[PDB]
Structure formats: structure tokens, C-alpha cells
Ligand binder design. Structure first.
Ligand code: THG
Ligand code: CL
Ligand code: CL
Ligand code: CL
Ligand code: MG
Ligand code: MG
Ligand code: MG
Ligand code: MG
Length: 159
């Protein structure tokens, strides 16, 4: 099964960080550890080093040479490279989320209370097609710059 995981500012702006949220990074790690992660080449270059404890699959029509990750050229190849696993995590960026959304059955979202200047957005999804099965709000604190709300949604309908 395919899931997307993303952190969204107001207006669904995503980035590679205008905010400083170690709690969100802990949420990201907890929910991706021991699962393959699929990302586009822009996201890969922004991370710079393979995420530990996860198979790192990079979707790009023009692969790099880095032997530390697995390079694939299509959504279908990305999925095949993951093989028989319970859950595949798609970690962005904008275009990769857009291509994978139709195949996804679960969303892990962090809704951040920040207005920011970026131009890359998380895909449009029809809220009526999803059910909110978890939500938790957290205030900002000495370690986290903004307030945020974790949410998990499960797909109920497809169009
Ligand atoms: N929800 C959440 N989802 C996201 C992002 C986020 O920002 N938070 N940002 C994008 C993914 N980018 C990264 C880049 C680096 C790391 C990262 O470095 N993670 C460490 C945890 C950080 C640490 O404490 O060292 C890890 O092992 O997962 C996580 C997401 C897309 N989705
Ligand atoms: Cl957590
Ligand atoms: Cl990308
Ligand atoms: Cl505090
Ligand atoms: Mg090689
Ligand atoms: Mg889009
Ligand atoms: Mg769309
Ligand atoms: Mg319904």
C-alpha cells in the first residue's frame, strides 16, 4: 500500500525550512522507519544523504550516479523496486506527490500554522474522499518554532 507523508504550511505550501519543528521530524522518522521511501531528485539533493533504516528510492528520468540509493525512472518502476512490503512511503516533492496521490490509500499530514513565501504546493485532494482517523494539535515551544497539527487520513473514495 502507498502512503504520502508531507508537512504543509498555509495554502498547502511545502518546502525542502521556514519552520523549525524537531517534533515533526520525529513524527516523520517514526512513520517512515523500516519502510521504503520514494522521493524525486530535487528532494534527494536537498536531503543529501540516505535516510537511515529505510530503502531510499529516487524517481528521476535522469538518474544521478550515487550508488547509495536506488534510481528508478517511473512510478511503476519505483513501486516494483519496493517489492512485497506492507507500506511504501512517498516523501515528495510536489510533482512526485501529484503523480502518486491516485495510487495512495493513506496520508500523513502535518498542518503547520505558518504563512510562508514558497511556490511548491502539495496536490489537491478531495476531502470528501478521505476520512480523518487521527488528529493531534501541538503548541509551539522552546524547541518548535510554530504550532502544528498531525493528521492521518485513510482513503474512502476514488475518482
Ligand atoms: N512530516 C514531514 N513530512 C515531510 C517533510 C517534513 O519536514 N516533515 N519534508 C519533506 C521530506 N524531507 C525530509 C528531509 C530530511 C528529513 C530528516 O532529516 N529526517 C530525519 C529526522 C531528523 C533528525 O532528528 O535527525 C529522519 O531520520 O527521518 C526528513 C524529511 C516531505 N515530507
Ligand atoms: Cl511522533
Ligand atoms: Cl522532488
Ligand atoms: Cl518550552
Ligand atoms: Mg551505480
Ligand atoms: Mg501539484
Ligand atoms: Mg491534481
Ligand atoms: Mg463517503
Amino acid at each position: 500500500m502507498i502512503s504520502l507523508i508531507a508537512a504543509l504550511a498555509v495554502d498547502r505550501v511545502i518546502g525542502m525550512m521556514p519552520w523549525n519543528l524537531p517534533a515533526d521530524l520525529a513524527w516523520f522518522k517514526r512513520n517512515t522507519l523500516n519502510k521504503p521511501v520514494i522521493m524525486g531528485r530535487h528532494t534527494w539533493e536537498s536531503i543529501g544523504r540516505p535516510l537511515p533504516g529505510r530503502k531510499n528510492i529516487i524517481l528521476s528520468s535522469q538518474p544521478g550516479t550515487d550508488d547509495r540509493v536506488t534510481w528508478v525512472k517511473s512510478v511503476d518502476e519505483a513501486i516494483a523496486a519496493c517489492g512485497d512490503v506492507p507500506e511504501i512511503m512517498v516523501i515528495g516533492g510536489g510533482r512526485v506527490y501529484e503523480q502518486f496521490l491516485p495510487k495512495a490509500q493513506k496520508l500523513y499530514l502535518t498542518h503547520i500554522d505558518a504563512e510562508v513565501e514558497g511556490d511548491t504546493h502539495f496536490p489537491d485532494y478531495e476531502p470528501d474522499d478521505w476520512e480523518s482517523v487521527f488528529s493531534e494539535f501541538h503548541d509551539a515551544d522552546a524547541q518548535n518554532s510554530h504550532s502544528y497539527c498531525f493528521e492521518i487520513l485513510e482513503r474512502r473514495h476514488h475518482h
